[PDB]
Paper text:
Engagement of unphosphorylated eIF2 in this catalytically productive conformation depends on binding of the NTD of the eIF2 α-subunit (eIF2α-NTD) in a pocket between the β- and δ-subunits of eIF2B, ~100 Å from the catalytic site (Kashiwagi et al., 2019; Kenner et al., 2019). When eIF2 is phosphorylated, the phosphorylated eIF2α-NTD (P-eIF2α-NTD) engages eIF2B at an alternative site, between the α- and δ-subunits of eIF2B (Adomavicius et al., 2019; Gordiyenko et al., 2019; Kashiwagi et al., 2019; Kenner et al., 2019): a catalytically nonproductive binding mode that inhibits eIF2B’s nucleotide exchange activity (Kashiwagi et al., 2019).
Compared to the αPγ and αP2 complexes that contain two eIF2(αP) trimers, the rearrangement observed in the αP1 complex, which contains only one eIF2(αP) trimer, is subtler. Although the eIF2Bα2 homodimeric unit is displaced following the accommodation of eIF2(αP), there are negligible shifts in the other parts of eIF2B, including the regulatory cleft between eIF2Bβ and eIF2Bδ (the average displacement of helix δ-α3 is 0.6 Å) and the pocket for ISRIB (the relative displacement between the βδ heterodimeric units is 0.4 Å). Therefore, the aforementioned rearrangement induced by eIF2(αP) was accentuated by accommodation of the second eIF2(αP) trimer. The β- and γ-subunits of phosphorylated eIF2, bound on one end of eIF2B, have previously been noted to block access of a second, unphosphorylated eIF2 (bound in trans to the regulatory domain on the opposite end of eIF2B) to eIF2B’s catalytic site, on its bipartite ε-subunit (Kashiwagi et al., 2019).
Numbering used by the authors:
A (entry chain J): 40 to 468
B (entry chain H): 166 to 518
C (entry chain E): 1 to 11, 25 to 134, 155 to 238, 258 to 295, 342 to 444
D (entry chain D): 8 to 98, 119 to 351
The structure:
């Protein structure tokens, strides 16, 4: 049983965190005061993975610097993250091309993205996948790891839903398609025509992007120089089943958990879903990134607490908070479902709901905040109010006596936002 | 004749007086496809009971009364046999068939008692049509004045006893308590609700959805964790399948445990129930008159393979799962009815007279 | 009554062609489980006399009505509607199985269904995850190479196990108001083709209309082909004996497992390869097994042996019996014929 | 040698991720093997430096999994061993008065402790026969291999019914009852929603426990608080069949995260759907039995009331080691 590689392709190439990602890659956003790269690194370590050949192109300097001050840097570790960086590639296709180049892996890696949030022990799937190999001698190329969920869960936004026509006797995939604005579907009869002994149209599956693979996946990505992702990879491999079949094999795990954030929406879900211990072991206060900055103390209603918080007087914490180090909160305050971060300084009489505060932010009095991200040091003056998903990032300020509309993406760059940084709502420069 | 279905598996010693059927082998496996001996309504009704497609107390009572209206409406009076007597002597085998499918809860018992007292109060001075219309209208009015207006008055009472900021606790599925919670939330009371559910008929999720799809902040947790949340609970609000004669409220298989731990942590228990579940009988504990779900359904799919798969092969092993449990009148503090907030030991003295 | 077990039969004769009366088989399956009085429907294509051969039925009580030739099952039921005053349990005359029919009726009664069919392992039927309720079914007409699955049903019943090689047993416990709808509408000429797909499709039309479909591995119905009857009687030799029995035979020859009954004169040194020794058969020579069909008025001798050759009513074959899968119809006074298993016509 | 470093680190990693090894006695034996390894592969000549060393690993461990009291109090006990042997040899300050002789003595004492720790199931099992008088109905709960050994030892000379609740978060009572009936005990599985209806008909309540605090009050697999509270409403005698090392010297509300909340997936699986947005699901695995419901701890020294358990602290752990 040779070791288990893990081709951690740690830079989501299709840009969807704008303007957020322009500062630090999404692979370094703080999910709950922890970097997504660390969540996936701890996941890969948990399932017994020797090497984690993390690949990065954009801002790879920052990622390498953050991974050198990690728990996976010191050579006593078992997950020898052998970072590898180039600027050329911009798609997982190009990344598997890079794998063809350096010929790193030898068998059975895990094409994990950078932002996977999971505790999925893949030993069962790996074992039966190697049995699938040894029986019919390597035609079974990939082996995705989907999760049984329900098509109305918040971690299934109107974008990521997938429909999979899959065999049932052996969980072999037959047809895959997204649901980016459909009301019907279409399944070529080739599935049945091959073997109509029984299929299934599974649409409770949630994509998890934990694809086991093979060196043959490197071969099949270097043969077709037009493939540009894993979605498109399987979507193009599933059609030519009679020329070197190379048949995928689905897999379900119903008791585990695993997601992959791809926007502020799915990010809100996976964050305020990690707070509720849904992914345990990888809860916050386990402090798997064993550093003194965010170690935390549980409580009723999961209202966590870091060191030196010094909450106010008569301020309540309904549920699912995660206070941070040194983050003072004034009196008569009110927080709920938020995820505060290390270093904040919240005012008095403030009200926070589902909100986010990454670090250094300085929210002021009277400030009503709901369902909104607030990235690094996005200080905020008095008598403000926000509205759903009103993400304001990157040192931006907001002046006194000022509201914001519903979807208010603002930033320090005027063009990338829908506003511009200043000490006011309008007239930012 | 109407046959008698077999039992399933070796029971427990102390329960050698109770029947242990099996959801799988339905009774109508040995029945006549055209509804011969038992009216089509009653055979369908019993078939869906033994299949567990009707769960609540009020659900069972209403499914029954609909079946009975179906019988009465499509009834043919035999040659020169009196209705007042042939009707009841024809309904007796249907009752035995239902009891064969799933043992009649106290609600169905009170409904049958009332219906037989109702039929046997008609004479020969009535046509078939007028008496039948009177029976159907009387059943309609019984439903509208014992399980529809009753719930109204019960909710309007238990709303005045629900103040703000107090995490009301509940148990499993129910109809009256969910109506109470949703109505009282509509009137403005900003509380929480701590749903407690049990295995294997995880009847908590029904009230869970019917709550969270109405706004109230829920918090779902299994039953072996009651002793965790009861510190901050401020009222318990249970359901009541049967209000016995001593006051010892019989209900789903865990209400006793809950009432006990919630009297230990000192949080006042309530039981809300209408004036038609006052089962005239009385019992002491939950061993003399219960049911038994098909025990083969206990086996939980935890881990990779169930530990009770070959449940029968092991000789000494003997599953069970009761269906009813009894809170004595000491652990209980409130019985809410359309008569007011009567105390649980003054059940037989007002629910009777 | 709850049910009214109407039976359909739409096209020598073709309905009662077998070891025992074929229509009796559904009639017996009706009688095994209650069902005193059971409507029937006969035709005019082959004759206005099906009933005129249905008078010796060894059953306690029946009802019979004929109709025209090219009348679809939906059209026939539409016609029969006047005497159909409750739920309906359609069937088909060419159905020969050991179905635990209590089960399908249990489905219809339990779930308060609206169309309880019966299937047994072109038509793609998407059944739900529980193995019972069905949500999709369509043939290759309304679709080229794909299966448009409406998004709502997938978002409401995610797992949908499909099934292809499912021989429909053509049982359909409908409900009354379905038949009322069928009587008002007229653009429908087959329940199994244009109504049942319509009900499946409109199942998400609250007071919805469920629809269920039990599956099993027990036994089939006799489809259209003259061929399937062979394997039908093949399995039936063993099936029917569960209730040969009494006949007039020679009791000398060597062979079992075929049509063994009265109304024939045979000799000895003869085998029976699941063949058809029907009515008025006669073979007196040293004949052997044939694994073929010998219908009414049979006659063969001089070393008679066949291999699947259908010999219909009025059978007289002699002059060097060499027969193989070569069907020859009525008026079969054909002897000198080296029959081949190549393309042959009756 | 860095081999000790990698071993300790793998150990604490396994403790954070998921129980290793599973059997509590096996985890105590592994903890002791590791602690012995520290006393053979590090740099120390004093006793104070070794106490600081042991505290520097014990803090890491008892802060890894706050509900792994086994390894915590095992470190406490090796500290007590250090105190005792250093004090008896040399002798309040610890000085490097002498050398390896002390280390040989420490290794010998740890070997003795480990030998007493590996043969405790058999001790309690031999102590059973005196307790399970024939024709009882012994109500266990959960799956505690000490209680299974106890009962399938006592039922080699008597006969008695055995109710067994199953823990409803995730059912292990099933496996205990299956292992029991493979010895013929006439056992009765049931979900623990019915601990109060089928308690009046119980004679003696035999429960394991994960950890005994120093009130006597314990921390045991969930739903055992309500079982004890019922079996005290019905005044049946509890029996906490716990060996002596499942004994941490903390005190009931002197510990945060007393319980151990696991992924709420087991209580309301993810397959559920939308309603998983507005529900705070709690899956407490361990519950806090107060000390006045218990009656009789059955430890490897014999039976003991709860009011003797405090004395065991004074005879097993040093009073300045209750903070590790």
């Amino acid at each position: 049983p040779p070791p288990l590689q893990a081709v951690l392709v740690a830079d989501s190439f299709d840009r969807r965190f704008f303007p957020i990602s322009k500062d630090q890659p999404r692979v370094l956003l703080p999910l709950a005061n922890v970097a997504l790269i660390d969540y996936t690194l701890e996941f890969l370590t948990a399932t017994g993975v020797q090497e984690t050949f993390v690949f990065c192109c954009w801002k790879a300097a920052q990622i390498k610097e953050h991974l050198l001050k990690s728990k996976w840097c010191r050579p006593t570790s078992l997950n020898v993250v052998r970072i590898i960086t180039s600027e050329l590639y911009r798609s997982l296709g190009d990344v598997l091309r890079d794998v063809d180049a350096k010929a790193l892996v030898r068998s059975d890696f895990l094409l994990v993205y950078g932002d996977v949030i999971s505790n999925i022990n893949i030993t069962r799937a790996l074992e039966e996948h190697r049995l699938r190999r040894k029986l019919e001698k390597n035609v079974s190329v990939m082996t995705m790891i989907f999760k049984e969920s329900s098509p109305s869960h918040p971690t299934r936004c109107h974008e990521d839903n997938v429909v999979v026509a899959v065999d049932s006797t052996t969980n072999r995939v037959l047809h895959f398609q997204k649901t980016q604005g459909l009301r019907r579907f279409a399944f070529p009869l080739s599935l049945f025509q091959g073997s109509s002994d029984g299929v299934e149209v599974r649409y409770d599956l949630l994509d998890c992007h934990i694809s086991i693979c093979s060196p043959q996946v490197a071969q099949l990505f270097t043969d077709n120089f037009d493939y540009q992702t894993r979605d498109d990879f399987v979507r193009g491999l599933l059609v030519n089943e009679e020329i070197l079949g190379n048949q995928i094999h689905m897999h379900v795990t119903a008791k585990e958990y695993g997601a992959r954030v791809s926007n502020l929406h799915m990010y809100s879900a996976v964050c305020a879903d990690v707070i509720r211990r849904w992914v345990y072991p990888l809860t916050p206060e386990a402090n798997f990134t064993d550093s003194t900055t965010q170690s935390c103390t549980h409580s009723r209603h999961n209202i966590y607490r870091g060191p030196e918080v010094s909450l106010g007087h008569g301020s309540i914490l309904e549920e699912n908070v995660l206070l941070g180090s040194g983050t003072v909160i004034g009196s008569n305050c009110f927080i709920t479902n938020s995820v505060i971060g290390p270093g904040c300084h919240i005012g008095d009489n403030v009200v926070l709901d589902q909100t986010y505060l990454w670090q250094g932010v300085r929210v002021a009095a009277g400030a009503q905040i709901h369902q909104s991200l607030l990235c690094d040091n996005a200080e905020v003056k008095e008598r403000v109010t926000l509205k759903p998903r009103s993400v304001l990032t990157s040192q931006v300020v907001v002046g006194p006596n000022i509201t914001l509309p519903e979807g208010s993406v603002i930033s320090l760059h005027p063009p990338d936002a829908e506003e511009d940084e200043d000490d006011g709502e309008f007239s930012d420069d | 004749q109407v046959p008698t279905r077999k039992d399933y598996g070796s029971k427990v010693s102390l329960f050698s007086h109770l029947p242990q059927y099996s959801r799988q082998n339905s009774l109508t496996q040995f029945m006549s496809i055209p509804s011969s001996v038992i009216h089509p309504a009653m055979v369908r009704l019993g078939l869906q009971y033994s299949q567990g497609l009707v769960s609540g107390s009020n659900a069972r009572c209403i499914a029954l009364l609909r079946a009975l209206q179906q019988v009465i409406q499509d009834y043919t009076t035999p040659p020169n046999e009196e209705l007042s007597r042939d009707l009841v002597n024809k309904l007796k085998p249907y009752m035995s068939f239902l009891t064969q499918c799933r043992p009649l809860s106290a609600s169905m018992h009170n409904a049958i008692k009332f219906l037989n007292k109702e039929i046997t109060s008609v004479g020969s001075s009535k046509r078939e049509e007028e008496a039948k219309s009177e029976l159907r209208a009387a059943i309609d009015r019984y439903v509208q004045e014992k399980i529809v207006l009753a719930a109204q008055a019960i909710s309007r009472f238990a709303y005045q006893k629900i103040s703000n900021g107090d995490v009301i606790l509940v148990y499993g599925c129910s109809s009256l308590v969910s109506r109470i919670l949703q109505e009282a939330w509509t009137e403005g009371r900003r509380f929480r609700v701590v749903v407690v559910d049990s295995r294997p008929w995880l009847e908590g999720r029904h009230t869970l959805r019917s709550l969270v799809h109405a706004g109230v902040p829920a918090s779902y947790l299994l039953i072996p964790a009651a002793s965790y949340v009861l510190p901050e609970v401020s009222k318990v609000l249970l359901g009541a399948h049967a209000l016995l004669a001593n006051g010892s409220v019989m209900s789903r298989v865990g209400t006793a445990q809950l009432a006990l731990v919630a009297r230990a942590h000192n949080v006042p228990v309530l039981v809300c129930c209408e004036t038609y579940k006052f089962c005239e009988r009385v019992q002491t504990d939950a061993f003399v008159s219960n049911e038994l779900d098909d025990p083969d359904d206990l086996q939980c799919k935890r881990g990779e393979h169930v530990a009770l798969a070959n449940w029968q092969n092991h000789a000494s092993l003997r599953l069970l799962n009761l269906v009813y449990d009894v809170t004595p009148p000491e652990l209980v503090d409130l019985v809410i009815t359309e008569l007011g907030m009567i105390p649980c030991s003054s059940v037989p003295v007002v629910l009777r007279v | 009554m709850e049910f009214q077990a109407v039976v359909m039969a739409v096209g020598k004769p073709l309905l009662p062609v077998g070891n025992k009366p074929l229509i009796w088989y559904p009639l017996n399956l009706l009688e095994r489980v209650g069902f005193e009085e059971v409507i029937v429907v006969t035709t005019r294509d082959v004759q206005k006399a099906l009933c005129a051969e249905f008078k010796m039925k060894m059953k306690p009580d029946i009802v019979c009505i004929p109709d025209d030739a090219d009348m679809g099952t939906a059209d026939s039921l539409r016609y029969i509607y006047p005497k159909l005053k409750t739920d309906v349990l359609v069937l088909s005359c060419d159905l020969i199985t050991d179905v635990a029919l209590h089960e399908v009726v249990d489905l219809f009664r339990a779930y308060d269904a609206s169309l309880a069919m019966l299937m047994r392992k072109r038509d793609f039927i998407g059944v739900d995850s529980t193995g019972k309720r069905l949500l999709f079914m369509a043939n290759e007409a309304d679709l080229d190479e794909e299966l448009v699955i409406k998004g709502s049903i997938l978002q409401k019943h995610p797992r949908i196990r499909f099934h292809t090689g499912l021989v429909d047993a053509h049982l359909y416990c409908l409900k009354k108001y379905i038949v009322d709808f069928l009587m008002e509408n007229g653009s429908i000429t087959s329940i199994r083709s244009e109504l049942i797909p319509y009900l499946v499709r409109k199942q998400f039309s609250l007071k919805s209309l469920d629809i269920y479909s039990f599956i099993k591995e027990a036994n089939t119905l006799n489809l259209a082909p003259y061929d399937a009857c062979w394997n039908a009687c093949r399995g039936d030799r063993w099936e029917d004996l569960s209730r040969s029995s009494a006949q007039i035979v020679s009791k000398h020859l060597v062979g079992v497992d075929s049509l063994i009954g009265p109304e024939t004169q045979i000799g000895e040194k003869s085998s029976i390869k699941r063949s058809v020794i029907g009515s008025s058969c006669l073979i007196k020579d040293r004949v052997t097994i044939t694994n073929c069909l010998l219908m009414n008025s049979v006659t063969v001798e001089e070393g008679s042996n066949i291999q699947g050759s259908v010999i219909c009513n009025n059978a007289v074959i002699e002059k060097g019996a060499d027969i193989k899968d070569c069907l020859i119809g009525s008026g079969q006074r054909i002897e000198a014929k080296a029959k081949r298993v190549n393309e042959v016509i009756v | 040698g860095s081999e000790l470093s990698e071993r300790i680190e793998s150990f604490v990693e396994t403790l954070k991720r998921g129980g290793g090894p599973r059997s509590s006695e096996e985890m105590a034996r592994e903890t002791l093997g590791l602690l012995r390894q520290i006393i053979t592969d590090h740099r120390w000549s004093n006793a104070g430096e070794l106490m600081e060393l042991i505290r520097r690993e014990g803090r890491r461990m008892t802060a890894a999994q706050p509900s792994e009291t086994t390894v915590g109090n095992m470190v406490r006990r090796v500290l007590k061993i250090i105190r005792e042997e250093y004090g008896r040899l040399h002798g309040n300050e610890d000085f490097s008065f002498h050398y390896a002789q002390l280390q040989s003595n420490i290794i010998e004492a740890i070997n003795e402790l480990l030998v007493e720790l590996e043969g405790t199931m058999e001790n309690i099992a031999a102590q059973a026969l005196e307790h399970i008088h024939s024709n009882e109905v012994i109500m266990t709960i959960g799956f505690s291999r000490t209680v299974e050994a106890f009962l399938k030892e006592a039922a080699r000379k008597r006969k008695f019914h055995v109710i067994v609740a199953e823990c409803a978060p995730f059912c292990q009572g099933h496996e205990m009852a299956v292992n029991l009936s493979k010895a013929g005990i006439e056992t009765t599985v049931m979900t623990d929603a019915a601990i109060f209806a089928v308690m009046s008909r119980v004679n003696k309540v035999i429960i394991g426990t994960k950890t005994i605090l120093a009130n006597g009050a314990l921390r045991a697999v969930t739903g055992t608080h309500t079982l004890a509270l019922a079996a005290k409403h019905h005044s049946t005698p509890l029996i906490v069949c716990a060996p002596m090392f499942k004994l941490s010297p903390q005190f009931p509300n002197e510990e945060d995260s007393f319980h151990k909340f696991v992924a709420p997936e087991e209580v309301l699986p993810f397959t559920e759907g939308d309603i998983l947005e507005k529900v705070s699901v709690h899956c407490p695995v361990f519950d806090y039995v107060p000390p006045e419901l218990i009656t009789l701890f059955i430890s490897n020294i014999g039976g003991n009331a709860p009011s003797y358990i405090y004395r065991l602290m004074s005879e097993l752990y040093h009073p300045d080691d209750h903070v590790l």
